């Protein structure tokens, strides 16, 4: 009921308040942290659900005891009775655990584990190949460098290249747990002591690239090859038609994906918008060919409005419609097939370019 | 340290016969259903019986205290709390209280003109228990912003105006925040802009053929799976707001006055024979539009048919530039708010 | 000291909890409760749990708290904390969560003894939701409240107000919803666990509606376009030619539709709505006419591949074509046989599927 | 002191002491009989590894301290008592993750002999080991066992209050329309011993419980048996190099929705699931190389003139494969025609093995 080591916990435990003998020496508090799974990412409410080993150790001088006290004891399970560092970053809140693992020689430590949001800066310029940073911090206020010195645990090293029990599983991948050492200072109780944790994650692209950007490819290039193969007029109507029909409820369907934040929408979401404004247009224009060609009514608006400009074109570039307008529309059929290739090219140099950036970090 | 705690324990017991700062760190989701806002907070209580000697302590000056030792100075307009996260903070006493409160605050919405609303809430502060609270800044500092904010959630921080009086004083914010259009730039305008383009050009299309009928019954089922889409994402499901029920009304509707009017002249043109003649209203009501607008009877019903077409045209390029109108206000409002 | 404290104090010193306020214990502790739905929050049909709210209202008589008023300044009402009371156990067997708990752990008690006891409850309550006319949903929920350990004979439970007077009652329910509430008819039981032992319950009914406006102009009105728009594709469109294009969008688009409308039709263990059994009989349909009309193009400018063309086929098509009223023509013929009977077979689909919504709709509104 | 059952009460709570057994002499075992009835199955989260659950707990024993001749006390036999005032077992749960959200009744039931009853729902959190490798036909054995905390068997010994087959056929208040429908609960008395002398009794209870395939028989079978056999339809006439192009892009367009609309629907994980890993991954890769194939067919035909010819190996390829799958463009054409059957009698075989798949996995789920 009562053993020896309960003997000790009661003399330890019957007689909050700094731990320390004298308030000059600071109470200097060791950190350190394990990151355990990245759980979610809110871009919307731009937040970071995580979970937290969370290390922490201090020594005291009102539990300090000798193994001679009661049978060779040197550990204890002490139950946290009101006994004596916060995240500025946190939002919202885990097996808590009572009882708080004190060593002979008066040092507190504990490893308690807990899921935490906290509030980020989260840039989706890049997707799917994306790479964050999140800098949940510890700090106190009240509690400035001469009560509260905050210190690593363990050197930055080992710290930074924690993947030890990382799980691995989901959708994020850490990569970086870098800390640092920073003192903020307001114009009252000057000497506060900051740490900061900069955990930076990463994404997984291959769930969003079979998704999001092997189907744009392939209807781009669906798209360019509809060009040269079909004439300018006839079947090619139909299978613009097929495509434009298809791409607005993809479109729908991936506007409803693709996360979006004050920042700006993904880069990759300005080429959706172009290779579908590229297929409006392009149906529009061979519709009026098909109905400018077979069907015929009024003329070419002058030369210098239209012919001038179709001369230019191709100068820059490289039955009265039979043969007079049917070369505005090849024309302008190559003007579109131009400007089809330009906006594929420039897509697969953004997505080449973020995934460099993505991979390269 | 224990003699000063002992000595202040001794010294101190009730009330010993209060300044304010409020700062918001984020705004967070803003229930519509529920009226209530939620939001982090972070709140400072200052106020000046608590004296030690100085000389004995060699002249501390500060010291920190269970919270549970020294008479503390409640949140009116609430729901819930939140389970928002303590050792007290002078050399002569005048403790101070820093905590995160967070809030879950009953607030009133208009929710009218989204995405672009644009909304005000009231935090009042006044005393529980003890009858007749003060600024610890300049009013000036408190409005202009919080040193201290996401600032890129779709909810924005605008203003927090401070200000009133069994009698006690309240100290009342006045927080306006500002919805961030640009969320919904791809989510909710862009799919709306491209779907009314897209049936702009199906127009185009020539009437009474098979072309047209099937890409008008794909944009419905378009139409379709985009109210679906963005039923949940709304606040609301087809919150029934101008320029989100409206646009929906005004633009699926005239699909579908356009689909049946195409699948009618659709099948009497099938029925190449005997038909019934065309009324002679329907004959003066065309032929004074098509106006109003610049086998043997096969072709007259053709000709009412596309130019009831021009007309459905017309109606739907005049809605396409009232919505643009209304769209270019309402930023223009929210702009300059 | 102000005269509600000078009275509590003495009156909850030598208060003792657990113990049945009543001085003869043979006699019952009767408790009236009574319900006020205010919001149906939710029903979720996957997990089988209605959220709701509700006003849950407890009186009862306790017979230790009775005062004189004369001698404590005429005090009528007092204030105590509800941990610092007898309460009853009465308890919903349904609930499985209790969801956001606006704590209030106060009540009042008259001089005479009756307690005035009563709190908001936002209840996850498990009910058998049965989804088979989606969206014209009516939903039977039920909240049965009661005594866990104590019996019949030591609380007996009834309704604070006439049966008729609850089940009426919609004032406080806001009309702001998905679900529109029709009526709470409470009933009164004693479950009989053994040949002694009895216990008292009181059920509510619940009883909503759906609000389909949403789904019948979301997932009936396109629904229904397509069949109709399907069916006038035998008008214009020949059994050859641009009917395979026409077939083909309305396919394409159809499947997107349907992949949607599956993703968003709620599904239950016993049965999906009777509604989704039309979406299939379309889909099934269209794949089948594509397939019919693709097939006669195969077999008019491409006829160099003879089917062998059985003559019991030739048969069966004449014996089928009489019933309903160069080997191209014969096979333009014979596909003309079948793009009537596949008409029939649409008109027939089209039919049933507008008499099942408009009985649906006659169900849900008699309701 | 005038009312029997106050004074019965203050009676028994005068000399009660909850930090010690209620037993008369040390050095004897107290019987805890336990009982377990299975509400409604509230959730299982396959990447977290838990089972949130509904059940009805129940514990019975005997109080010799509790002993009161009724008719002493006015014929009373019944009586309640705060929880916190008596001494209840610490029977806890491991394999727990958390628990709450749940009615705290803080009354226990006693009668004149001194036996107690204590009756308390739990909405249990509990670690379990979910397979969710044959999603939807999916079976799950989860455990449930409750310890003595800090008594061996020597002071507290665990028992049912009904037989075992009772318990296993316990499904009276279940809410059997949801996705899992629990199969049985079959319970187990074990002895968990860290020394001779210290040795702890444990009753499990083994909750196995099965999904409902028919859940997801319009958010998943319905979809992947249309796309399939649209897919199947898209091989036949449209041609090679034709409008095939725009069906086929169109359909992967499909094929893309409905994944991005099932990634959040499905409870699955990383891990995956051979149903849907495979015949989502068989499917999409057969749609982008008919897709492709398609595009260099169609181009080679339009286009034309190409200096190069068809390659030698590609003609003894195109006899090794026509034989059993049964000018330049002309062999172009013969040459697309022929990949188009080859690609043909492959999706064929993989529907067939979908089929197969599906019906195995409900065979081996049971039939109805």
Known sequence: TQPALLRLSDHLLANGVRPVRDWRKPTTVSIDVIMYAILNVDEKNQVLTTYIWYRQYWTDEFLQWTPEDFDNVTKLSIPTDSIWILINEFVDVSPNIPYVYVHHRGEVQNYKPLQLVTACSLDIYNF????????????????????????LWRSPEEVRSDKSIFINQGEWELLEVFPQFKEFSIDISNSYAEMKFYVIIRRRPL??????????????????????????????????????????????????????????????????????????????????????????????????????????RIAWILREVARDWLRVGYVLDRLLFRIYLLAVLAYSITLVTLWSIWHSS
């Open 128 to 151: 799917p190949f994306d790479v964050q940073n999140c800098s949940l911090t510890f700090t106190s206020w009240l509690h400035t460098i001469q009560d509260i010195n905050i210190t």
């Open 207 to 312: 769930f969003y690239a079979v998704s999001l950007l092997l189907p744009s490819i392939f209807l781009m290039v669906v798209d360019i090859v509809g060009f040269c193969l079909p004439p300018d007029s006839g079947e090619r109507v139909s299978f613009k038609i097929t495509l434009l029909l298809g791409y607005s409820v993809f479109l729908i369907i991936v506007s409803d994906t693709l996360p979006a934040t004050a920042i700006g929408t993904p880069l990759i979401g300005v080429y959706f918008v172009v290779c579908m404004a590229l297929l409006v247009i392009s149906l529009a224009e061979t519709i009026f060919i098909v109905r400018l060609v077979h069907k015929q009514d009024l003329q070419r608006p002058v030369p210098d409005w239209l012919r001038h400009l179709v001369l230019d």
